Amino acid sequence: CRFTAEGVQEIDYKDIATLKNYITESGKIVPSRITGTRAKYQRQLARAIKRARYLSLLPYTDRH
Amino acid sequence: RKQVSDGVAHIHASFNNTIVTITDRQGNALGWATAGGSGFRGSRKSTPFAAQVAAERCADAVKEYGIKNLEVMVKGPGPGRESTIRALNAAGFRITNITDVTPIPHXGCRPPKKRRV
Amino acid sequence: PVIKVRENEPFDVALRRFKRSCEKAGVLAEVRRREFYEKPTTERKRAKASAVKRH
Amino acid sequence: KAXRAS
Amino acid sequence: KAXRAS
Amino acid sequence: KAXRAS
Amino acid sequence: KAXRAS
Amino acid sequence: KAXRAS
Amino acid sequence: SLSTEATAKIVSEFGRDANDTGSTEVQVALLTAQINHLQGHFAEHKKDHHSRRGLLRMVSQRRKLLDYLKRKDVARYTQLIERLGLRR
Amino acid sequence: RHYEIVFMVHPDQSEQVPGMIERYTAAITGAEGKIHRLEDWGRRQLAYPINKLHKAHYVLMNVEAPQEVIDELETTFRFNDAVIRSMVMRTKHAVTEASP
RNA sequence: CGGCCGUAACUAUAACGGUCCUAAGGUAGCG
RNA sequence: GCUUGAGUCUCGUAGAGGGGGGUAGAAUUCCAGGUGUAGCGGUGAAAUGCGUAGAGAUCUGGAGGAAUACCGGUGGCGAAGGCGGCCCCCUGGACGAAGACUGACGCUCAGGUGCGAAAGCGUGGGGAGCAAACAGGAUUAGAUACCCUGGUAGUCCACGCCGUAAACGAUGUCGACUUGGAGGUUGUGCCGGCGUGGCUUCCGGAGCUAACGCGUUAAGUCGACCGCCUGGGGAGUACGGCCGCAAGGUUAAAACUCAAAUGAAUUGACGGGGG
Ligand SMILES: C[C@H]1O[C@H](O[C@H]2[C@H](O)[C@@H](O)[C@@H](O)[C@H](O)[C@@H]2O)[C@@H](N)C[C@@H]1NC(=N)C(=O)O
Ligand SMILES: [K+]
Numbered sequence: 077c078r079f080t081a082e083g084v085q086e087i088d089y090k091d092i093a094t095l096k097n098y099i100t101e102s103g104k105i106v107p108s109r110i111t112g113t114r115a116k117y118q119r120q121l122a123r124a125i126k127r128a129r130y131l132s133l134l135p136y137t138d139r140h
Numbered sequence: 141r142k143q144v145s146d147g148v149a150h151i152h153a154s155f156n157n158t159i160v161t162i163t164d165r166q167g168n169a170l171g172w173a174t175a176g177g178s179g180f181r182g183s184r185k186s187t188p189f190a191a192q193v194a195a196e197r198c199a200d201a202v203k204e205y206g207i208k209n210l211e212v213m214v215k216g217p218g219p220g221r222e223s224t225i226r227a228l229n230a231a232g233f234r235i236t237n238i239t240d241v242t243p244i245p246h247x248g249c250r251p252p253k254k255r256r257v
Numbered sequence: 258p259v260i261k262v263r264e265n266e267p268f269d270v271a272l273r274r275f276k277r278s279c280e281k282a283g284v285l286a287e288v289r290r291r292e293f294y295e296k297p298t299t300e301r302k303r304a305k306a307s308a309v310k311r312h
Numbered sequence: 313k314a315x316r317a318s
Numbered sequence: 319k320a321x322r323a324s
Numbered sequence: 325k326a327x328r329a330s
Numbered sequence: 331k332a333x334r335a336s
Numbered sequence: 337k338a339x340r341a342s
Numbered sequence: 343s344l345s346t347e348a349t350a351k352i353v354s355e356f357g358r359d360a361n362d363t364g365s366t367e368v369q370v371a372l373l374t375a376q377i378n379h380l381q382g383h384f385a386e387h388k389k390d391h392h393s394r395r396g397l398l399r400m401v402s403q404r405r406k407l408l409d410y411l412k413r414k415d416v417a418r419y420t421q422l423i424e425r426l427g428l429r430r
Numbered sequence: 431r432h433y434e435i436v437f438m439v440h441p442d443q444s445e446q447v448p449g450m451i452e453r454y455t456a457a458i459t460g461a462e463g464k465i466h467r468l469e470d471w472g473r474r475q476l477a478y479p480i481n482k483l484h485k486a487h488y489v490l491m492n493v494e495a496p497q498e499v500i501d502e503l504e505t506t507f508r509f510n511d512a513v514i515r516s517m518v519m520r521t522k523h524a525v526t527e528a529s530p
Numbered sequence: 531c532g533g534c535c536g537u538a539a540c541u542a543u544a545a546c547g548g549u550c551c552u553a554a555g556g557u558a559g560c561g
Numbered sequence: 562g563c564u565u566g567a568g569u570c571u572c573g574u575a576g577a578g579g580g581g582g583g584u585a586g587a588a589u590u591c592c593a594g595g596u597g598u599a600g601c602g603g604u605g606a607a608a609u610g611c612g613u614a615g616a617g618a619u620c621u622g623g624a625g626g627a628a629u630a631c632c633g634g635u636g637g638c639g640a641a642g643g644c645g646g647c648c649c650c651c652u653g654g655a656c657g658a659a660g661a662c663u664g665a666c667g668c669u670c671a672g673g674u675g676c677g678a679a680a681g682c683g684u685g686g687g688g689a690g691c692a693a694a695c696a697g698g699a700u701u702a703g704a705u706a707c708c709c710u711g712g713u714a715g716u717c718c719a720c721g722c723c724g725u726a727a728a729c730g731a732u733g734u735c736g737a738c739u740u741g742g743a744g745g746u747u748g749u750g751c752c753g754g755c756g757u758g759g760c761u762u763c764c765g766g767a768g769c770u771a772a773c774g775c776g777u778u779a780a781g782u783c784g785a786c787c788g789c790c791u792g793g794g795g796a797g798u799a800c801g802g803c804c805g806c807a808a809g810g811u812u813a814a815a816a817c818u819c820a821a822a823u824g825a826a827u828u829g830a831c832g833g834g835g836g
C-alpha cells in the first residue's frame with residue numbers, strides 16, 4: 077500500500093497521475109488484492125476515481 | 141466502385157453465428173458475409189471454421205474496393221472471434237488495429253431467465 | 258481490449274497480444290456472466306461457496 | 313375382478 | 319377448469 | 325396430441 | 331443392472 | 337462496550 | 343443532532359454548572375430540544391422509519407428520566423416540565 | 431460550510447470565464463464568505479466527449495459559504511448553458527494548498 | 531365461442547385414449 | 562449515601578444506516594436517417610418469428626425506462642426486513658481517546674404499539690429490459706411443462722393497504738464467568754516493534770451434546786425475565802371472534818384413525834453423483 081506508506085489522509089480526485097496507477101488499460105479500478113492497497117484507502121480510491129470519471133479527468137471505458 | 145483503401149472489419153461473433161461486415165472508416169458497409177450464409181447450418185454454423193469462410197467470402201465481396209488496411213472491431217463471445225481475424229490477414233489485408241467492442245452494461249437491463257435444460 | 262499493431266511485427270504476435278488483453282479485461286467471462294439473470298440469493302450462494310473453497 | 317380399490 | 323381451449 | 329388430456 | 335431405475 | 341457482543 | 347452551542351446553552355440553562363452535563367434536568371432538556379427539532383424533519387420525511395426509531399428512543403429515554411426524577415424529587419419534576427412545556 | 435466547486439465551461443466561452451469567476455466569487459463574498467482556493471485550470475482534453483465537445487475550460491474553487499448561496503450557485507450553473515458540468519463537494523476543512 | 535368414438539376389477543359414469551373439424555370451441559360465475 | 566450498572570457532555574473515526582433532491586457513464590429497446598444485401602434469429606436439431614415493403618450487420622442523430630460493471634472483500638452498515646455509481650440537503654445509530662457530570666435512573670416484558678422481503682390489493686402515474694397468465698413453435702405415447710419465438714399483469718414511481726417467508730444462526734433478550742490458535746475490519750496509546758478497545762470470519766481445547774456438532778460471538782458454567790413444546794395423522798383445518806377492499810392473516814378445536822411418526826449416526830445397496 078503506497079497510501080499508508082506515504083500517510084495520505086485522503087486520496088484526491090484531482091490527483092490524476094496517482095489515480096492512473098490504480099486503473100487498468102480498460103479504465104477499470106484495479107482490486108486491492110492486486111495493488112496491495114489497504115481496505116480503507118481502496119474505498120477512498122474508488123470514490124476518487126468515480127469523481128474523476130464524472131468530471132472527465134479519467135475515462136469510464138477505453139471505448140467512448 | 142471507388143477505392144476505400146483503409147477499411148474496418150466488424151466481427152459480430154455470437155454463440156450461434158458470425159457476421160463479418162467490412163466498412164469504410166465512417167462505418168458505411170462495403171460488403172458482408174455470415175457463417176450461416178457460407179454453407180454452414182446448426183452445429184457447423186457455430187464453429188471457428190464457418191467464421192473463417194465467412195471472413196474469406198467477405199474479403200471477396202469487397203475486392204473491387206481494393207482495401208489494403210483493416211482495423212478490426214471484434215464483438216461478442218462467439219467461436220469465430222479469432223479465426224475471422226486470421227482469415228483477413230491471410231486474405232492480404234494489413235491488420236493495423238484489433239479492438240474488442242463487446243457491449244458490457246455497467247450494472248443496466250435484466251438479462252433473460254436461466255435455461256433449465 | 259484495444260491493440261494497435263506496431264511496425265515490423267508478426268500478425269500471430271499482434272493477435273496473441275489481443276488474445277492476452279481480452280483474457281485480462283475478462284470480457285468473455287463478463288459476457289457469460291450476463292447471459293442469464295442470477296437471483297441475488299443465487300449470487301450470494303455462489304459467492305459464499307467460492308469463499309469457503311478458497312479457505 | 314373388485315369391491316375394495318379393486 | 320378446461321378440456322375443450324379452456 | 326393437446327390441452328384437451330393431450 | 332440399466333435403463334429401467336437402473 | 338453492551339448490546340452489540342458487549 | 344444538536345449543535346455544540348445549542349447543547350452548551352441547554353447545559354447552562356437547566357444545569358447547576360457549565361460542567362453539570364449529567365443532571366437529569368439537563369438530560370431531559372437536551373432530549374426535549376432534539377425531539378422538538380426532529381418534529382420538522384419527520385413532517386417532511388414521513389417514511390424515514392430508521393431515523394424515527396432513534397427519535398422514539400429519545401422519547402422513551404426522556405420518559406424514564408422524568409419517571410426517575412418524579413419519584414426522586416417531585417418539586418424538581420414539576421419545575422422541569424413547566425420550563426420545557428411537557429404534559430408529563 | 432466548506433465546499434470544493436469544480437465547473438467546466440464550453441471551450442468557446444473561455445473568454446467569459448474571468449467574468450464568471452468574478453460574478454460567482456462576488457456572490458460568495460457578498461454573503462460573508464471566503465474564497466480559500468481559486469484555480470483557473472484553463473482548457474483541458476476531456477477523457478470522453480460531453481455534448482460533442484472534446485475540451486472544456488475547468489475552474490476549481492474552494493469556498494467557505496452558507497448553504498443557501500451555494501445552492502443558488504448550483505442553480506446558476508444549471509441555467510447557464512456555458513457551464514457544461516459542475517461538481518460541488520463538501521470538505522471538512524478549508525483547502526488552500528496548491529491543487530495537483 | 532364444436533362434434534365423434536372408445537376406456538376404471540358390480541353396474542353406471544368416464545379422470546384417461548384416439549379421432550374429425552374450427553378464427554376460437556363458453557372460462558369464472560350462475561342455472 | 563456510594564460509583565462499579567445505566568445514562569449525559571467534550572473531541573475524533575469508519576460505514577451500500579435512513580429520508581429527500583439532483584446528476585453521470587455503459588448497455589438494452591424503440592424511432593428517424595446513411596451505407597449495404599440476403600439472410601437474420603433461435604436450437605441438441607428444428608420450427609414459430611423477423612427480412613427484398615431491404616432485415617440482420619454497420620454508422621449517425623433522437624426518445625425513454627430501469628439498473629448501477631470495475632471497486633467488491635465469509636468487506637461494511639442497520640433491531641430485523643434490508644441497504645451498493647457520483648453529488649448535495651435533512652437525519653438515526655455505533656465506536657474510540659482523555660477527562661468532567663448524574664447517581665441504580667437498571668434488566669426483562671403478557672396485553673399494547675411500531676417496523677416488517679417477495680408476491681398481492683386500491684387510486685393515480687410510468688413502462689426500456691424482464692416476465693406469471695396467454696398465444697404460437699418444438700419435444701413426447703401424451704407434454705396444459707422443461708426448450709424456442711412472442712407476450713399482458715407485474716416488476717418501476719407516489720400515496721394507502723396487506724403482515725406473511727426455509728422472515729434461518731431453523732439458536733429470545735440482558736448480565737457474569739470459563740484454556741488456545743489463525744484471520745478480516747475499524748479506532749487508539751507507546752518506541753516496522755509493543756500493546757489496548759469495538760465489530761466480525763474460521764479452526765479447535767475443557768465442558769456440553771442422542772449424535773451431528775457447539776466451543777469466550779457456546780449448544781460450556783450460572784443468574785433475571787419473556788415466548789414456546791407435550792406421539793403421528795386429521796390440522797394450523799373446521800366453527801366462533803378479531804383484523805383485511807380482497808387475497809387472506811391471526812387466535813384455534815373435535816370426532817375419527819394409526820402404533821408408530823421422528824432425529825442423528827452405522828453397514829450395505831443404489832444414483833441419468835465424483836475420482
Ligand atoms: C426424463 C424424464 O425424467 C423423469 O422420468 C423418469 C422416467 O423417464 C424413467 O427414466 C424412470 O422411470 C425414472 O425413474 C423417472 O424419474 C420425469 N421427470 C419425466 C422426464 N421426461 C420428460 N420431461 C419428457 O419426457 O419430456
Ligand atoms: K448548465
Ligand SMILES: [K+]
Pocket residue numbers: 670
Ligand atoms: K413493563
Ligand SMILES: [K+]
Pocket residue numbers: 713
Ligand atoms: K408488459
Ligand SMILES: [K+]
Pocket residue numbers: 772
Ligand atoms: K459418533
Ligand SMILES: [K+]
Pocket residue numbers: none
Ligand atoms: K378464523
Ligand SMILES: [K+]
Pocket residue numbers: none
Ligand atoms: K390422536
Ligand SMILES: [Mg+2]
Pocket residue numbers: none
Ligand atoms: Mg450518517
Ligand SMILES: [Mg+2]
Pocket residue numbers: none
Ligand atoms: Mg412488491
Ligand SMILES: [Mg+2]
Pocket residue numbers: none
Ligand atoms: Mg399496483
Ligand SMILES: [Mg+2]
Pocket residue numbers: none
Ligand atoms: Mg421474453
Ligand SMILES: [Mg+2]
Pocket residue numbers: none
Ligand atoms: Mg418464455
Ligand SMILES: [Mg+2]
Pocket residue numbers: none
Ligand atoms: Mg410464521
Ligand SMILES: [Mg+2]
Pocket residue numbers: 728
Ligand atoms: Mg433473510
Ligand SMILES: [Mg+2]
Pocket residue numbers: 729
Ligand atoms: Mg440463512
Ligand SMILES: [Mg+2]
Pocket residue numbers: 731
Ligand atoms: Mg422460526
Ligand SMILES: [Mg+2]
Pocket residue numbers: none
Ligand atoms: Mg453488525
Ligand SMILES: [Mg+2]
Pocket residue numbers: 765776
Ligand atoms: Mg468449532
